[PDB]
Paper text:
Two proteins from [name], a rodent-infecting parasite, have been identified to be essential for host cell traversal by sporozoites. These are PbSPECT1 and PbSPECT2 ([name]). No pore formation or host cell membrane wounding is seen in the absence of either of these proteins. In contrast to PbSPECT2, PbSPECT1 (∼25 kDa) has no detectable primary sequence homology to proteins of known structure or function.
Numbering used by the authors: 48 to 82, 88 to 197, 206 to 240
The structure:
Amino acid sequence: NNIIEEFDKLSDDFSNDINATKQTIKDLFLDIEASDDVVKLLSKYSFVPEEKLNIIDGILRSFIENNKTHVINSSNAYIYIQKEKIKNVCNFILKKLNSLIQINELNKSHIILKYGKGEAKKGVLESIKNNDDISKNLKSELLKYRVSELINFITPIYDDFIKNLTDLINDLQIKLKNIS
């Protein structure tokens, strides 16, 4: 009976984590928007990743609700094991998302360096200078650092980001089906 409450907890926790991720990515975009014409463009760009995360959040919540039915008349084994499986899927999604966040953190820094000029926000140069996680090659190429050009630069990066979010949604729908 409280089992339904526990599944509800799965949904709610997942929603919280997803909203946190959403805020992180929004912070990426906001940090990039420093720096009136390109700003509106980036703010437009920032709406699609939020939509993708709202999909992931909603797909999981929809799955759990429709799976409550199977939980009431099944063995305790199925309940505990299934709960475990759902937790695993959620953790998978969150791990992939966090990896994606790291990737686009480096992408953000790259964008700020190549175009934007804080230069207080372009104190990314010190973070790049101290970054021991990137190759010295990339470091070298980066420390050397109008609109149609910016579009030309961020279009592959942004399209790849949304593509990764789109395939992640596909992975989620596949993994949920395997336990559906």
